[PDB]
Amino acid sequence: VDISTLPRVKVDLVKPPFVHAHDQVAKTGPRVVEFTMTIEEKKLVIDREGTEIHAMTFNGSVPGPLMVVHENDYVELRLINPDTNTLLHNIDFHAATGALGGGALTQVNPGEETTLRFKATKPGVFVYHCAPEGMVPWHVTSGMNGAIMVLPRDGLKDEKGQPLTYDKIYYVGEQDFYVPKDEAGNYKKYETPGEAYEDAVKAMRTLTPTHIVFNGAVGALTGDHALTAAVGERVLVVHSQANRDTRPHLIGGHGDYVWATGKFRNPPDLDQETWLIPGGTAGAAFYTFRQPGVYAYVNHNLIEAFELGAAGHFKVTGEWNDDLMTSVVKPAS
Amino acid sequence: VDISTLPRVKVDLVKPPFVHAHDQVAKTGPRVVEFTMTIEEKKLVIDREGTEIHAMTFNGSVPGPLMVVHENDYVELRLINPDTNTLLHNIDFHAATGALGGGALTQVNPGEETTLRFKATKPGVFVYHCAPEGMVPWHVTSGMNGAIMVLPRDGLKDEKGQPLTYDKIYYVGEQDFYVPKDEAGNYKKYETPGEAYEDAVKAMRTLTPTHIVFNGAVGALTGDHALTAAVGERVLVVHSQANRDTRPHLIGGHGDYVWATGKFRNPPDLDQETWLIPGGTAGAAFYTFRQPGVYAYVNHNLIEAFELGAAGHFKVTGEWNDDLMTSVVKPAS
Amino acid sequence: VDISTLPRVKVDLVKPPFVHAHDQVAKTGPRVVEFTMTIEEKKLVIDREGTEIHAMTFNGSVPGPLMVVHENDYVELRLINPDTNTLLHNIDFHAATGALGGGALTQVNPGEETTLRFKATKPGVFVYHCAPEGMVPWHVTSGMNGAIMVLPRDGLKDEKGQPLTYDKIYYVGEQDFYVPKDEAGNYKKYETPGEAYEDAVKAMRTLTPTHIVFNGAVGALTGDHALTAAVGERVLVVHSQANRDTRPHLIGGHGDYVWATGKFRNPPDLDQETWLIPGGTAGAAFYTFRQPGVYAYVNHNLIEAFELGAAGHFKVTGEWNDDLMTSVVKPAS
Numbered sequence A, B, C: 001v002d003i004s005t006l007p008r009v010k011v012d013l014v015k016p017p018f019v020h021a022h023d024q025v026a027k028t029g030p031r032v033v034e035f036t037m038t039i040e041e042k043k044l045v046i047d048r049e050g051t052e053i054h055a056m057t058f059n060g061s062v063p064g065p066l067m068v069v070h071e072n073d074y075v076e077l078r079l080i081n082p083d084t085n086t087l088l089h090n091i092d093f094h095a096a097t098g099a100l101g102g103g104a105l106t107q108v109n110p111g112e113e114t115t116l117r118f119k120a121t122k123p124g125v126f127v128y129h130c131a132p133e134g135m136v137p138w139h140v141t142s143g144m145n146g147a148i149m150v151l152p153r154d155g156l157k158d159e160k161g162q163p164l165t166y167d168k169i170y171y172v173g174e175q176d177f178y179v180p181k182d183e184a185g186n187y188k189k190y191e192t193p194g195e196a197y198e199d200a201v202k203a204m205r206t207l208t209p210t211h212i213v214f215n216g217a218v219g220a221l222t223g224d225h226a227l228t229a230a231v232g233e234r235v236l237v238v239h240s241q242a243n244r245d246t247r248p249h250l251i252g253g254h255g256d257y258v259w260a261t262g263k264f265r266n267p268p269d270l271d272q273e274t275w276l277i278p279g280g281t282a283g284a285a286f287y288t289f290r291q292p293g294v295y296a297y298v299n300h301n302l303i304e305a306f307e308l309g310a311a312g313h314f315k316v317t318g319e320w321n322d323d324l325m326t327s328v329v330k331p332a333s
């Protein structure tokens, strides 16, 4: 088919954990969906101690923004590498077929741009990430990854074929960082990317992250940036991990319907407490809130959550249900 | 509904790997099921070398006892923290909805008790664990975790909707411990919990357990404490890991029906050799023994099993089936 | 039944990643399928640096060869330990029932052989590995593992019960090695297996592989030994990991149908980007190629893939489909 005869729609992306507006059920036929992202190398402070790294980002954030299309739409990405950056970059979409997910066709030096198009033939949530030949894990574990959601044209379905419709969606990107340490255990610091590269490789080869964070920093999804919901609201949480396994858990809730490995032609797993998202995968969990208050959303390696950073919060408004849970006798002597 | 109009039944818990008596198919309507647990901080020897730690337990055991109810029963737990303990504790049930699984409502200092009630709205096996704000992984990885089984009211079902009925059930709790080491690699030792806390945090942050054990110690489920069965018996093995992934395997057998992530509204996976239970999850495997002899039940990271402790035994009585397996020619020159 | 009345067929094994000829749909009734393997202890160079280890192999390769039978065939293995080896060995089949998978019946000193028979009662791909009491992880992580495929008698089926027929099959064995290091980080070297044993145990207990490789060495499945396919071909990739989790991914493709934990009575997961194969398991992924070119097949812990060795290639011939993917604007200033 002549792709030039199809509608074109330009998407304006938003910063995670928020997600650009879209329709769950497709209101048009197939479209070419146009996205632009600008690569930004920048310093980021990632913990409460003030540890600052040289991050590599799509569109200025870790993770990169969530892109949303429907099955059999075409994704057309303009990828810009401005001359204020110093490295070569590209992009691999796990949603795409051919050319190493796009990476073989999108190598951009500083000062260059490119436009890639692919057909989104499989529904699900998928990782995307930079992947320059020979330097792949360094770019990925510097923050250069995000996700894309390819919705079925008739939206999501439960294990019986009945519709599932979310009221809110959030995208939680989980990032393992490998900040090199000296023998005494303090984080080093480097003057150029090339001077950093060998100790970055050394640090990665330990297979022991120094930090594991949501939305780019310890505490990013807390306080004034906590996730929010109301009792009775249906929430989809998309979670990705481009390099390392994770095991999400909503403390005080469940995943009512979970696609742990993210692919919507499969029936969801029901009533999960915790789910495994393998490294290199995006998953999605659907929950209807039943109680108000603070929830923690964590990687349930609790060391990874509470020591290394992989924990955020929901603040949920509404009525308390004492049938579902109550303190019969409050703590007392 | 007026919960006061429902029957109350008091359960008397038993020490793992055994499980209190219960009915698979509910013989009554919904009930308030009353449990009591008393927290005990105690020294435990966890390996053959004599390594002794300061464990934190529910009811004196690692893991804490398996609680069993049916879907839409109410769980009413009296949690006691005697004044012979020194720390603050609480409890989070992954089966429950609201207040961080109960933790926000059950904070008990030494000398205090509390009673929590929640409705068990989802069937499955679930973790429970202590979770005091700011000190969560330390309590969990000191042994303060167990599991609860919420049976469907009409018992278990296979992938076709047909009943599955177990003859025996066992609960295997798997515990990762992080005993601090000095530079030479020997385990340290500490005079108070507060003096231990920083090196416990340091040890946890390595993400490398020093010990990974079933039922609280190397070898606990061997010898006179091996699990037992007969040929032809249907056995359910509930397995939990509150903090770290595991991959159970019955050496010489299978999981005929497995809920790897523990939730009974899902069809089981059939004929598994090995299954992944993510950290923060309980799973359950159903097997019908077909051969007598010794079996090993392991985490099939065989280093974790045979070096670090994650191995137990079954001793199975009955007839040998030479059709299923035989030595045609015994080892010989 | 009198096994002596059944047909016998002798299989002649081939070196991975290739697989001996077989029929997907069984063309005969049940058979005794006869295999022979000869254990070989040998030196292997496993990386580009020239690191040489003392490997322990079935039939001279890491992994051992893929064996293929049908459900309810009998597997009859002659296992030979020649007197040129120095250690005791045996074999455990995860496909088998009883005697620790066969290990209790197959202990062979150098200069001995044995013949084991078992009934392959469950369809799926399964690990086999050596397992000498007390030394199990050392033999496994020295390379002494492979896999066996037990096909359903009517071949593979999709999630709807429709046939799935592969045109090509490959077996990728993934091996974690634990080469002991000195304090400075260089690999040691040892003069006998007994002198190596304690530092091998020490190295294993770090839970941090030094190398993670496909088909026995860094780069083994690249260059003149890349995997091959044509556009439109249906390929099954069997992947095993006897000791540690992995997460396979075809870079530029998908797993159209995946049995991540390898057992064919279960419906496959559709459209996977990445899948988790738990340590101690074999899995299988079915894909129909749609684009030509180079693909990388990796463990999608990208550190494990590109630093530690867990990466191979496909070279795929045929026509490029610009509807599915194209460069709209090639990289340019």
Ligand SMILES: O=N[O-]
Pocket: A249, A251, A252, A302, B092, B094, B101, B131
């Ligand atoms: O369930 N909370 O750690």
Ligand SMILES: O=N[O-]
Pocket: B249, B251, B252, B302, C092, C094, C101, C131
């Ligand atoms: O299957 N045993 O390690």
Ligand SMILES: O=N[O-]
Pocket: A092, A094, A101, A131, C249, C251, C252, C302
């Ligand atoms: O998807 N490639 O790393």
Ligand SMILES: [Cu+2]
Pocket: A056, A088, A089, A090, A130, A131, A132, A139, A144
């Ligand atoms: Cu990059």
Ligand SMILES: [Cu+2]
Pocket: A092, A094, A127, A129, A280, C249, C251, C300
């Ligand atoms: Cu990738």
Ligand SMILES: [Cu+2]
Pocket: B056, B088, B089, B090, B130, B131, B132, B139, B144
């Ligand atoms: Cu506690």
Ligand SMILES: [Cu+2]
Pocket: A249, A251, A300, B092, B094, B127, B129, B280
């Ligand atoms: Cu928890």
Ligand SMILES: [Cu+2]
Pocket: C056, C088, C089, C090, C130, C131, C132, C139, C144
């Ligand atoms: Cu061996």
Ligand SMILES: [Cu+2]
Pocket: B249, B251, B300, C092, C094, C127, C129, C280
């Ligand atoms: Cu095994």
